[PDB]
Each structure stands twice: as structure tokens, then as C-alpha cells.
Amino acid sequence: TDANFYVCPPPTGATVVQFEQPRRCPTRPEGQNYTEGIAVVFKENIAPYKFKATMYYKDVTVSQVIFEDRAPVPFEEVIDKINAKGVCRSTAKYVRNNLETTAFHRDDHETDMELKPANAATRTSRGWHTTDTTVNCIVEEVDARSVYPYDEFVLATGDFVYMSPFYGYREGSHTEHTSYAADRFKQVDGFYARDLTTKARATAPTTRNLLTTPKFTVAWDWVPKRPSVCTMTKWQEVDEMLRSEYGGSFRFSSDAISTTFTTNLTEYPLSRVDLGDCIGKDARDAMDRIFARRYNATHIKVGQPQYYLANGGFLIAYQPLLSNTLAELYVREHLREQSIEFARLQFTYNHIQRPVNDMLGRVAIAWCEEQNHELTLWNEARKLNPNAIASVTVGRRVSARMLGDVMAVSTCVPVAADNVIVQNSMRISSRPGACYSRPLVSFRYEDQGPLVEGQLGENNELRLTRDAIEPCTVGHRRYFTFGGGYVYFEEYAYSHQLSRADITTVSTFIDLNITMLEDHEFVPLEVYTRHEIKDSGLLDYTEVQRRNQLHDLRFADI
Amino acid sequence: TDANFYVCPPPTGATVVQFEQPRRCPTRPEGQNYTEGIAVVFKENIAPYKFKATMYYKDVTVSQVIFEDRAPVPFEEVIDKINAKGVCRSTAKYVRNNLETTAFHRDDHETDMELKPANAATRTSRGWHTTDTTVNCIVEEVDARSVYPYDEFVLATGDFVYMSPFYGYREGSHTEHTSYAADRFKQVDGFYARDLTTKARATAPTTRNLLTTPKFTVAWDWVPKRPSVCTMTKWQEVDEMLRSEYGGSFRFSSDAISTTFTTNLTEYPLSRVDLGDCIGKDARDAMDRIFARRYNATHIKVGQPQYYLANGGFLIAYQPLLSNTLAELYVREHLREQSIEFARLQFTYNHIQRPVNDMLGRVAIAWCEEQNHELTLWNEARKLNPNAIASVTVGRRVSARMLGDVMAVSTCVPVAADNVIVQNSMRISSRPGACYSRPLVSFRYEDQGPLVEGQLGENNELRLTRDAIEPCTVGHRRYFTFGGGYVYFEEYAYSHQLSRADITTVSTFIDLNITMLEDHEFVPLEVYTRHEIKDSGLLDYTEVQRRNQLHDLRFADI
Amino acid sequence: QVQLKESGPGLVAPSQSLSITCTVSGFSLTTYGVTWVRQPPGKGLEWLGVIWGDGSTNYHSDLISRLSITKDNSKSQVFLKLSSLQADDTATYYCVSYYGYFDHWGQGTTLTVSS
Ligand SMILES: *[C@@H]1O[C@H](CO)[C@@H](O[C@@H]2O[C@H](CO)[C@@H](O[C@@H]3O[C@H](CO)[C@@H](O)[C@H](O)[C@@H]3O)[C@H](O)[C@H]2NC(C)=O)[C@H](O)[C@H]1NC(C)=O
Ligand SMILES: *[C@@H]1O[C@H](CO)[C@@H](O[C@@H]2O[C@H](CO)[C@@H](O[C@@H]3O[C@H](CO)[C@@H](O)[C@H](O)[C@@H]3O)[C@H](O)[C@H]2NC(C)=O)[C@H](O)[C@H]1NC(C)=O
Ligand SMILES: *[C@@H]1O[C@H](CO)[C@@H](O[C@@H]2O[C@H](CO)[C@@H](O)[C@H](O)[C@H]2NC(C)=O)[C@H](O)[C@H]1NC(C)=O
Ligand SMILES: *[C@@H]1O[C@H](CO)[C@@H](O[C@@H]2O[C@H](CO)[C@@H](O)[C@H](O)[C@H]2NC(C)=O)[C@H](O)[C@H]1NC(C)=O
Ligand SMILES: *[C@@H]1O[C@H](CO)[C@@H](O)[C@H](O)[C@H]1NC(C)=O
Ligand SMILES: *[C@@H]1O[C@H](CO)[C@@H](O)[C@H](O)[C@H]1NC(C)=O
Ligand SMILES: *[C@@H]1O[C@H](CO)[C@@H](O)[C@H](O)[C@H]1NC(C)=O
Ligand SMILES: *[C@@H]1O[C@H](CO)[C@@H](O)[C@H](O)[C@H]1NC(C)=O
């Protein structure tokens, strides 16, 4: 078998995911009225609306070697030159030194030229341009997303558009939010699209919107707003959650959520809203399902469920429970007082509540300490390799990088293994003494498509930039992941390919049956007579920490 | 809500915490006489004695551009010039080329000058100096600590003082340890303090001690030695601990301690010491509390508790236990032999001890393997970020760094969020092409206090040195933690501030509902026409590992 | 030179709370502590407690449940408190400073518990 390759692009920042941090676990339990039970937490339905938008812009530069900037394209040029004929006007207008100025392509004359598809781009992010003073016209199709407020929508490039995607004039959408002058927007009725790759023209009309931002022109199809779905969505069904009362506020804790919620001790009147049919129905249905799964044989329900609004925008549904052993103590004590109703009886017998408070207290503290141990370790690995940590946290291969203290994320494009080829050598002939640290690769996004140049990354990743170069060494030997198996390289030359099952695996935590042997270092004689560094494998943490120390010494020498 | 900021100073080494390492877990169980039970381990009461001490010293240098060194200040100058008037003598004495030498401030004349408070310092580490040949007088108030032996006390600067803090002549303290000549120490009766910040003079006397070390003069108030407290203290109450006999020595193991103790198979005669009332009382009280918490319903106590001295200075109290199922086997077998007393009966029936030895053997081995897995991962993260690992291990924000193979630790000073301001720009105008990697900040240690300059660190940390500079890039976008929320910066310019709840959170381990999109890289045209590097976020582990490779190539080119 | 003087009610009823204040001069209470000692009629001395320069305090095992000591550094006075007084509490209370170990002692106040 062979795994699919991935060409992960660099995220621009359209999607930023903050990540949780450690907490202050109490040294000794202090919460009152401890109790276990089932819970279902609901998150605010952000209602993400995704759509594709076309971006237009031009580039202008001076041939003397200066003054390079970007500017948008007017509306008439997009709907007449580009839409009707797929061509861009040669002349371009811009502001230079706070003064109106113009330019032309090679200063030839006022003419028109057709647009051509981008050389590499992506199959899902098609783009076009007029050329691979100088003027260039560029048109690109990118994705866009909007949230419940629908006041702004972010493009795939990371730039926000302060305007509602549903704004228009066809269906009285003038009331929609907008932050641009009336002269900066235009809507066309009966508009027909034209795929520049084929120029076959659209088959049916689609009203098109057009906006001109200070840096580019954006256009998207105006679609009526869909009916609003339920305002809340099930975030996660908690199998077990402990509730504690302290400081006039409840405290909910779990082992899987890794977060503590706080409420005002008053049940939110869910009945006040007619959405109970969406939340009350889904919530109650989950309580019985979880209860029948494991609590039907050992626990008993205590009254009807409860709903509370927690800090951060979460709605927590609750169903307090108590073990059969604790139930025996309550009924036994109740019989003494008599000389069946668990509600309005729990927390009454202080002597019976004293041991359970301490018992459940250790469980809550244990989860908090364990979660802090995992959170601090997870956060460190996240900074060390956001690609692997981001991919596992979402269940699919994903690209990500840290934009300071927040992590930007984007999706990766997969490519089949039969569409990639690896070069036979990793040495660069342009300059001796330097060679690529990883094998070079050439591939195509799809079968029969154009070939592109790139470099092999980690975990079948395909890098579009060939920059992983390093001073070369003697006795080189490395294994690189390539599809299902591995590709072996020695002395910066392709040797052969081997499968995944041809190498010893240590899947288990501890394996003492490794038939290892005392390796004897064998260095070529050129290391002594020519003083050329010998191979040392990838840099260990101390090696990189020690390697930069030498750089400081070299700088001091200089 | 907003979290308090922290200005963590660099630890000097007064407090060094070594940290545990992996162990050699047995591949198969080999211990004999396995048994479970409750345990309470006691550590030697080090009895840390903390106090504040004042340090005095002078600096002398030559104006020609040489010979810069430090020297202490005599006793008469401290008690007459500094204590009575808060001034330092202009002239200073020192040894140059193994010869007596003197100096003066600007070579003017023999005069006196007053001391002024330190420009930044800390509210809890107040310091003073005469000036912000050249001579400068400095006086500082730092913390000191001493351990049970009371033979030496370490100052906050990390320098040890080989002398007992209780040494003196008032109450016959001549027998206290000391390693300095009699002429290097002086004690003053009826001494009056004077806070240099106010010069209000003390209200009541306090006998003061004075010592002159080779580098500085130290003075502290002589306080009589407090009565000695119990010699041992409860280190941790073990909820479950397994005891095994092997190689003529017991072996105690637990799941929370992560350390194995070894004893000589002989109970330490705790009754031999009268401290049993402190250890025997506290120990026995913990045995019943732990037993009544979870072992009263499933286990039975086997005889009276036991005490053993383990390697490393630990005293382990024990209470062997056995499950009810195992109890049935013993009583059932005892009845056969009869053709109630669990003591002197356990380990007798070999056929009954054979399965329990193997059963508990897996538990002990399982804990050892799991602990090694966590220890090796924890130790690696410790080297990667001692500040976060040190803070969670103690429960409070703390500063720390690795002094080779040992970690030095110190406490951090908190500052309110309303006392810090962030600059609107992070670009430095002194030299184009370079700019700070994090926003600059200005704050004050307390309300109405003087303002200080610094840089914003990680996790609301405030750095007193502005040195985090980097080659600048195009399309810059970063989020930095600032108080409760985040501060957004783009193109090295302050954009706006946002709250903590305005970013998607992935608190749970796996979240598949991330509404991400395929980001399309948007680079300014100057990257091509001006060849200026584009932003790439923080450096991934491979990037830093790949970035230094280029440096090696650049050095080779040079 | 150091001196200490006690001030109390002299006579109190049983089961009430006692309050005695010891005024001291000659040393700063911020650095040195003060110890309390009592002596019933015809018996030896008995240690009650102590308050060091810091806010920490130590009390006898037989009086920890009822004994309590506080102070004020500005006034150089140490307040002694004792709740649930019994009949045998009748004794002469003294306040002994730590400028030394037990160098200076106060004159002492004779207290009697009776209705
Ligand atoms: C739990 O209860 C507290 C206290 O009642 C709630 O905080 C309160 O929240 C209300 C809004 O729901 C705040 O009122 C608003 O405050 C400011 C002026 O302070 C202004 O914007 C508005 O005119 C309005 O009055 C109120 O100030 C605030 N009180 C406090 C003491 O913070 C809290 O929201 C409740 N939490 C949950 C999760 O239900
Ligand atoms: C467990 O038992 C062993 C063996 O008895 C203990 O080791 C012994 O410890 C004593 C001191 O307690 C050592 O005696 C001293 O040794 C040297 C000369 O070797 C010298 O400094 C003194 O004159 C004195 O004799 C003794 O040598 C040492 N024996 C061995 C074989 O190492 C051990 O301390 C016990 N462990 C525990 C935790 O109780
Ligand atoms: C724990 O729960 C009990 C039972 O609800 C609380 O005790 C009651 O408190 C209310 C006021 O909140 C009183 O009117 C009742 O008389 C109390 N007793 C009973 C039997 O209901 C108790 O306050 C809760 N504990 C905390 C710390 O809030
Ligand atoms: C396990 O414990 C048993 C019981 O104490 C030990 O067996 C006794 O050993 C002593 C000498 O240490 C003998 O005098 C007894 O006759 C033995 N039997 C009994 C029933 O007490 C046994 O030695 C221990 N195992 C190991 C490996 O030390
Ligand atoms: C709970 O268990 C009882 C006893 O077996 C059974 O009758 C009942 O149907 C169960 N209920 C659910 C909801 O599983
Ligand atoms: C090899 O594996 C066997 C089990 O298959 C194990 O018993 C043995 O100890 C192992 N040998 C080594 C040298 O680790
Ligand atoms: C142990 O449990 C028994 C049976 O319920 C009970 O009588 C006894 O008081 C319990 N002892 C302790 C110390 O909790
Ligand atoms: C979104 O969350 C729901 C539960 O609220 C889950 O069933 C669904 O699979 C999630 N969708 C995706 C695309 O991950």
C-alpha cells in the first residue's frame, strides 16, 4: 500500500485557533455540595457560511534600477474586458506621491491582452494572470467565510472585507451592514460567468456583486440568506461530570473537557425560549442514552435535569446522580427521621455529605493535576511542530504555523503517489560544497496535468520551494519517507527504494529484543587529508544548541 | 477579566532543584512476599530560616580607555556616614598589582555624597547608589536563607556566607560556627536603622551584626535562635504502596511518588526517640484516615503499623493490607490446618502467595514503565522551557533556568495590568531593516511609581531588556498575549486589541468541527522586485534546524 | 535597657474571655518576639505561647484551643487573649521578651477567676 502525498500551503491567517492553558488546582478540596452526574454542554452556533469569491487587481512597477505597488481594477473593465473577452486593459491608474499617475505595459500603447492560467497554483484555487514600466493584470478565485453576525467575511488571503456578504439591491438587502461608500459597490442582474480556462460562457444567469477595496476588487454571487438554524449546537456529550458549589457559584469539572465551568447557581429558564424543542429535546435524549449505557446498573437519577449558563458562552445541561451505596445511606437515614424522594434530601445530612465531599474532592483535584501535566506537554510539542499537532487535533492532514501566541491553520491539498517523481541526485552543480538536505521531487497536481518543481518534506509532505540546503559531508546515509515505503540515499545519490515492512518496528512501548551491535565508525580518509566535515545525521537538540554557540564564536572572530 | 503581569528576574543560583531520572524496571517480577498497604513517607525537616540582610560595597574604575574591580566598605563608614547621614565616603581603598592603592570620585577631593534609590530594582529588593577615576557606593537589601545546620547562609545574589546567622556576643553565641577572623566582624548594641528612602530613623533599637567578606560587607539583625521544631515532616500521604522483599532488602513502590525506596528489612525503633509523639501520632492518624476513605469496605489491616528508614533520608511508615478475597483464602486454608490472626500467617502458604506475587508484580512493573515514560518526556520539556515546567511543578508563576545539569529557580514579581502600556509600533528607527520581534512595553511596579522600559514576553511576562530583534519581513501578522485578551500587530504596527473569547478554542483533545478553509498565500510584489524576505511566522523546529544550516554555508562562503 | 509592664482586669468571672496587654520598650517588635508565662499559687512556672517578629505564633498544646496572641508594632504592645476561663486559671501572668532568650521579664499581673 501507498499513502497519498500532501502539498500543504502556508496559512495566511484566515483561521486562527487559540489553545487552552494550565489552571490553579486547589491543594486541598474546598467545594461544597459535591455530586456526580451526566452533562451535555452546548456551544453557541456560530453558523459559518462559506462561499467562493473572485479577486481582481493589477501590479505596476518602474523599469529603472523602484516604486512597486498594487491597485484594483475598475468595474467596467471587469464586466466588459474580462467577463466578455477575458482580457485586461494595458493602462493602469494609481496614486504616486499623493498625485494621480498612469502607466503602460512596456510603455508601448493603450491595448488589451488576454489572461493565462497560473503556472502552478492549486486545482481548487485557480488563478490567472497576463504575464508570468511593467504592468500585470491578475485574477484569482479564492474561498471566503462569514460568521453568524454576517457583518464581515474573510477571504482566503487573510484580508477581511468589512461588508455583509448578503448586501445588495435585488431583494431589499440595503439594511445589511456595510462600511464602503455607494460608489465603491455595484451589482449586476442577469450576469453571465465565463471560465477563463475554457471561455465557454455560463449557461444560466447569476446576479453578481462587485466591491472595490483599497487594494483589490472582489466579486461574488449574491445568494439569499438561508433560514436561521438552531442557535445552539451540541459541543460534546460528557460521560461523567462533577458539580461543586463554592463562592456562590457552581463549578463543573470533567476528565475529557479539561476545562472548568462556572455558573451563578441559578438554572437558566430554558423554557423562556421556544428553542427548547431543539436543545431540551436533544439534551434529554442524551441524558437517557448515557445513563442507560453505564449508570442504569449502579446509579439513580436525582430529580429532573438542570440547565445553567457558564462563563464563556456555554450552556451546560445537567442530570445529578448518586451511587447505590450512597442511596442506601440516605434512605436509611430518612427512615430514622421518619420515626423515596432523593430530591430536597441531598446535602441535608451533613454527616453523610462530609465523606462524599472529600472523596469526590480527590477525583476533581486528580483530574486537574493530570490535565495540567498534559496541557503543558501538549503546548510545548505544538510549538515544536504545529503541523503534526494540528493534524491530529482535527483528524486530517492540516497545515499550521504560530503567528506569535496564536496558531494559524489551513487545509492541505492531497496528490496521488503515481503523480510524483524523485530525482536521482540531491547535489547542486551550481556551487560545489553545498547540497540539498532532502531529495528533490517533481510532480503534477492531477493526472496529465503540468509538472511542477518542489522538494520532499517530512511525512510525505511536498514543499514548493527548494531551499533546504546544507554544507555537504562524507559518508552520507539517510532514509526519507516516500509514499508507503522509504527512499534510501547515500553520498547524496539515489541508491534504491524499500518498503515499510523492511525495517524493524518498535510499536510497543518497550522492546528488549533488538538485535543491535557495537557499530564501528568508518570515516573516509579525505576527512583527515582534506579536512572536510563528516556526516553526523540530523542535529540533536544539544547539537543545534551547540552549533549556534560556534556561530557566536565565528561572529566574534569576524 | 484580566490576568496580572509578571516581571520574572533571572535566578542567580541561591535555590537549585535537581530533578529525578529514569530507572531499570525488571522485565519479569522477581520480588518475594508481595503485599499492598497504606504508607506515609516523612522527609528530614531541613528547617529553612529566612531573613533579610543588607549588603554594602563600592566600585572603582580608571577613566583612561581599565582596571575595574569591586571592594567592600569599612564598618565605621557604614555606622557613621551611611547609618547616621546616609552618605558614602568619596575615597575608596583597594589592592592593585598586590599593592595598596586609593582612588577618588573624579579625583576631586575627599568629600561625602548622599545615596539615591535605584532606578528600577524591585519593590521587595530596594537598593541605593551614589551615581547611576570614578568611584560609586552601592547599598542593597537582599533576602537570605539558612538550613538546619545554621553553619552558612546564602544571599539572594547566590554568594554564600560561611558563617552562622546567629553568631554574636550578646547572648553568648561565640560557640556558633564561623570561618572569618575576629577583625572581620562587629556587632552593635542599641543600633538604630534608617530607611534611606525616607531617612525617618528607626523607632526602637535592634542589635545589628556586621561582616566584611572579600567582596562586600553584609549586615543583618541578630535574632535569637527559635526553639527547634519536630525533626521530621510529612512529605506525602501515599494512598497505595506495594512492598516487596528482594536481595535482603525491602522495596517500596507507588504510582504517585515515582521513586522506589529500599530498607534493611528491620523496623526502625521509633520508640527509641521521644519524637514518636510527633511522628507516631501524625503517622497513625493518617493510616486510619486513608483506610476509612477507601479500604474500610474492601480490605483489612494486617497487624500494627511499621516504620523503616529508606535510602536517601526518608522514614516510611507502613500499614500492610490484604483484600477480602485474599483473606478468605487464608482463613479457609487456616481452617484446614486447624484439623483469625492474619499476622504471622501471611507469606506462610506458598501456594497462596505464588499467584499474588505474580499479580502484584505486573502492577509494580506497570507503574515503573509508565513512570519512565513520563519522566523522560517531562525532562525534555523542562530543558525546552524551564519557566513553564517550573511554574506548574510549584503551583505559582516562577522563573528558572538550567545551570548545566541542575535547574536554578527564583520567584517572580507580579504587576497589575493597569500599570503597563504597550507601544503603538515595534519598528526601530535607529537602523532600517531590523525590528523587534515582540511589542515594546512601558510599566511601573506600583501605582504612581516611576515608569520603566521593557519588552513583552511570553504568557504576560515582562522582560526588562529590549533585545528581541529580527530581520523584518513583508506581510507581517502576529498575535501576542496581553493581559486577559490579545494584542494584534500587523506590518510591525499596532492594529487593535481583542478579548480571549474572540478566538476559536480547542480545549478538548480532538475537535473535528473546525470551519477552516484553503488559505491562498498573498505576498506583496516587493518580495520579487526588491528581494526582501516574506514573513513566515515563528520558526518551526525544522526551520530553526534548517536555518542554522544556512549559517554554516554563509560562514563557509566568508 | 529593656522593660515590660502588664495590664489586665485582675478579676474576671469563669467561662468568659480574658484580655491582657503587655507594653514593652527597648527593642523593636518587628524583629524580636515576646513570650507569655504564668504561675498559679504555689506551683512552678508554665509556658503559654510566643509571638515572633513576624505574624507567626506558637501556643502550648494544653492551651492551643483557647490561647490566642496578637500585637501592634506601632504601639509596641502585645495583646494576650484566652477564652473559656476555668477556676484554676487564677495565676500571675508575665510577658517575657526575646531581645535575648529570656533576658528581661515583666513585673507580672495577678489574675483571679471567680464569680
Ligand atoms: C452572574 O451574575 C453576575 C452579577 O449579576 C452577572 O454580571 C452582571 O452582568 C450584567 C449583564 O448581564 C451587567 O450589567 C451591565 O453592566 C454594565 C455596567 O456595569 C453595563 O454595560 C450595562 O448597563 C449593564 O448594567 C452587570 O454589570 C454584571 N455585574 C457584575 C457585578 O459584574 C453575570 O453576567 C452572571 N453570569 C452568568 C454566566 O450568568
Ligand atoms: C543497611 O545496613 C548497612 C549494613 O549494615 C548499613 O551500612 C553501614 O552503615 C554504617 C553506618 O551506619 C557504616 O559504618 C561506618 O562505615 C565507615 C567504615 O566503613 C566509617 O565511616 C565508620 O567507622 C562506620 O563504621 C558501615 O560501613 C556500612 N556498611 C556497609 C556494608 O556499607 C546501611 O547504612 C543500612 N541502611 C539503612 C538505610 O539503614
Ligand atoms: C448545599 O445545599 C443545601 C441544600 O440545598 C443548602 O442548604 C440550604 O440552603 C438554603 C439557602 O440556600 C436554606 O434555605 C436551607 O434551609 C438549607 N438547607 C436545606 C436542607 O435545604 C446549602 O446552603 C448548600 N451549601 C452551600 C455551601 O451553598
Ligand atoms: C517471606 O516471609 C516469610 C514469613 O516471614 C519468611 O519465612 C520465614 O523466614 C524466617 C527467617 O527470615 C524463618 O525463621 C521462618 O521459619 C520462615 N517461615 C515462616 C512461616 O515464618 C520468608 O523468608 C520471606 N521471604 C523472603 C524471600 O525473605
Ligand atoms: C435498566 O435496567 C433494568 C434492570 O435490568 C431494566 O429493566 C431497564 O430496562 C434498564 N433501563 C434502561 C434505560 O436501560
Ligand atoms: C526476546 O523475546 C522473548 C519473548 O519472545 C523474551 O522472553 C526475551 O527475554 C527476549 N530477549 C531479549 C534478549 O530481550
Ligand atoms: C467501616 O465500615 C463499617 C461498616 O459499614 C462501619 O461500621 C465502620 O464505622 C467503618 N469504619 C470506618 C473507620 O470508617
Ligand atoms: C460537528 O459537530 C457535531 C456535533 O455537534 C458532529 O456530529 C459533527 O460530526 C461535526 N462535524 C464535523 C464536520 O466535524
Numbering used by the authors:
A (entry chain E), B (entry chain F): 109 to 173, 185 to 251, 267 to 473, 501 to 719
C (entry chain I): 1 to 9, 11 to 116
Task: Paste lines from the article.
Glycoprotein B (gB) refolds between prefusion and postfusion conformations to facilitate herpesvirus entry into host cells. Here we describe stabilization of the prefusion gB ectodomain from herpes simplex virus 1 (HSV-1), determine ectodomain structures at 2.9- to 4.1-Å resolution using cryogenic electron microscopy (cryo-EM) and isolate a prefusion-specific gB-neutralizing antibody termed WS.HSV-1.24. We used structure-based design to identify mutations encoding alterations capable of stabilizing the prefusion conformation of HSV-1 gB and determined both pre- and postfusion gB ectodomain structures. We propose that prefusion HSV-1 gB evades neutralization by most antibodies through an iso-surface display that is coupled to structural plasticity.
One antibody, WS.HSV-1.24, neutralized both HSV-1 and HSV-2. Although the gB binding of these antibodies differed in surface plasmon resonance and ELISA contexts and several retained binding in a cell-surface context, WS.HSV-1.24 was the only antibody that bound infectious HSV-1 virions. We determined the single-particle cryo-EM structure of the antigen-binding fragment (Fab) of WS.HSV-1.24 recognizing gB-Ecto.H516P.L531E. WS.HSV-1.24 bound at the DI–DII interface to three (306, 357 and 358) of the seven gB trimer residues that our analysis revealed to be refolding, exposed and not occluded by glycan. Thus, the prefusion-specific WS.HSV-1.24 antibody bound an epitope comprising primarily the interface between domains DI and DII, as well as surface loops from both domains. The prefusion-specific epitope encompassed refolding residues that were not exposed or were glycan shielded, suggesting the epitope to be immune recessive, consistent with the observation of no neutralization in the donor mouse serum. We also identify a prefusion-specific antibody (WS.HSV-1.24) and show that it neutralizes by recognizing three of seven less masked gB refolding residues, two of which are located in the flexible refolding region between domains DI and DII. Although the cryo-EM structures presented here provide strong evidence for the pre-triggering mechanism of D48, future investigation is needed to confirm that WS.HSV-1.24 recognition of prefusion gB can in fact induce conformational change.
